[PDB]
């Protein structure tokens, strides 16, 4: 990405579509992933995709902990 001195009055979309939108999507995917991580569904380093029972047990063990910490911190401010 580059910082443009001009504001691109007549060509703002040209600069946006090739410099801002890709960076915006690159940040948005990570922000969405971390938001999903916050509200439960912690990152599963090990997951069994072959056994349905094991996958169900793993999903049943996804206790939300970081979300509780965030809620506790934000409720005292």
């Amino acid at each position: 990405i580059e910082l443009p001195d001009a504001i691109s009055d007549g060509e703002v979309r040209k600069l946006v579509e090739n410099e801002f939108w890709p960076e915006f999507v690159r940040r948005r995917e990570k922000l969405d992933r971390i938001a999903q991580w916050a509200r439960g569904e912690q990152p599963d380093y090990l997951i069994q995709n072959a056994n349905r029972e094991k996958r169900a047990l793993l999903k049943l063990a996804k206790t939300p902990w970081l979300g509780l910490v965030v809620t506790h911190f934000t409720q005292a401010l």
Partner: protein
């Protein structure tokens, strides 16, 4: 089937098989090859092409034992002549031969079975209830 041929068996026995003896030897060799295949667990599609020397030795030895005595006789004598054999094995192969036949088995042979508590499992009861509150990305 037919891991081994008939010429090397003839050389090993120092005799020639003819008439029903040739057919009997071929049938015995086919039986022994099938038993070795089922013990090892492999298939050997092209039978007399790869056929490692270990399985050839096993099948030739077992065919020789089967031809020498099919009734698994311990001691047999006719008049003055007498001869006593060792203890015959349970199968066509002695326990020492079985282990090397089991060499081709994957890992050390300690295969396991996946048990279950009679449950199917539905790892989706709680995830599909979420309603899309974003831009659809």
């Amino acid at each position: 089937a037919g891991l081994a041929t008939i010429d090397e068996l003839q050389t090993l026995m120092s005799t020639v098989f003819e008439d029903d003896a040739l057919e009997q030897a071929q049938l015995v060799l086919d039986i022994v090859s099938s038993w070795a295949r089922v013990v090892s667990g492999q298939m050997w599609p092209d039978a007399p092409a790869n056929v490692p020397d270990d399985v050839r030795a096993v099948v030739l030895q077992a065919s020789r034992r089967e031809l020498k005595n099919p009734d698994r006789v311990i001691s047999r004598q006719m008049g003055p002549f007498n001869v006593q054999y060792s203890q015959p094995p349970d199968g066509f192969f002695y326990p020492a031969e079985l282990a090397i036949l089991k060499r081709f088995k994957r890992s050390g042979g300690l295969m396991t079975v996946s048990t279950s508590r009679g449950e199917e499992g539905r790892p989706w009861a709680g995830k599909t209830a979420y309603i899309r509150y974003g831009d659809g990305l």
